[PDB]
Ligand binder design. Structure first.
Ligand SMILES: O=C(O)[C@@H]1CCC[C@@H]1c1ccsc1
Length: 165
């Protein structure tokens, strides 16, 4: 299972790791995707997770959207984890680069509470434009279940650990 994580709180752990490599190694029950409302897995974590599934995540996601329509910002859906995990929890954090309300980041993290353990990225961080330090703070203050955060960028991982209150 999960190895090499730094414990931040009772239930939040963090590691400088590529979430795709981490998912292939652990095969967790749940891997969180940093999804958008259309489940178009183009870039960032979504593009990387989808490419690791050989586009099977995108094919499944297009069928989900055809049936259900788009997700809400702050919402989620559970789909297959493919070769990476049992399930993928596609969570939509607000995209600050699209002017979405950063207050929706807490609602996005609340989706994690429906799963006893998750491998996840920092929601709304990276190409979503939010401050990752704020994302980590909202994560620790919102998620009560066991979350193993994979931070791809070493420099950001170091900054997140060194500034963690
Ligand atoms: O973790 C990072 O370094 C950033 C911030 C949030 C997710 C993003 C990422 C993760 C896997 S590819 C890009």
């Amino acid at each position: 299972s999960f190895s090499g994580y730094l414990k931040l709180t009772d239930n939040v752990y963090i590691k400088n790791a590529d979430i795709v490599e981490e998912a292939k190694k652990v095969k967790p029950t749940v891997v969180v995707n940093a999804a958008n409302v259309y489940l178009k897995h183009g870039g960032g974590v979504a593009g990387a997770l989808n490419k690791a599934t050989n586009n099977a995540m995108q094919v499944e996601s297009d069928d989900y959207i055809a049936t259900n329509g788009p997700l809400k910002v702050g919402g989620s859906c559970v789909l297959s984890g493919h070769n990476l995990a049992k399930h993928c929890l596609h969570v939509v954090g607000p995209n600050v680069n699209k002017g979405e309300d950063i207050q929706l980041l807490k609602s996005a993290y609340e989706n994690f509470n429906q799963h006893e353990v998750l491998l996840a990225p920092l929601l709304s961080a990276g190409i979503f434009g939010a401050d990752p330090i704020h994302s980590l703070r909202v994560c620790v203050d919102t998620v009560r279940t066991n979350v193993y955060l994979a931070v791809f960028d070493k420099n950001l991982y170091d900054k997140l650990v060194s500034s963690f209150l």
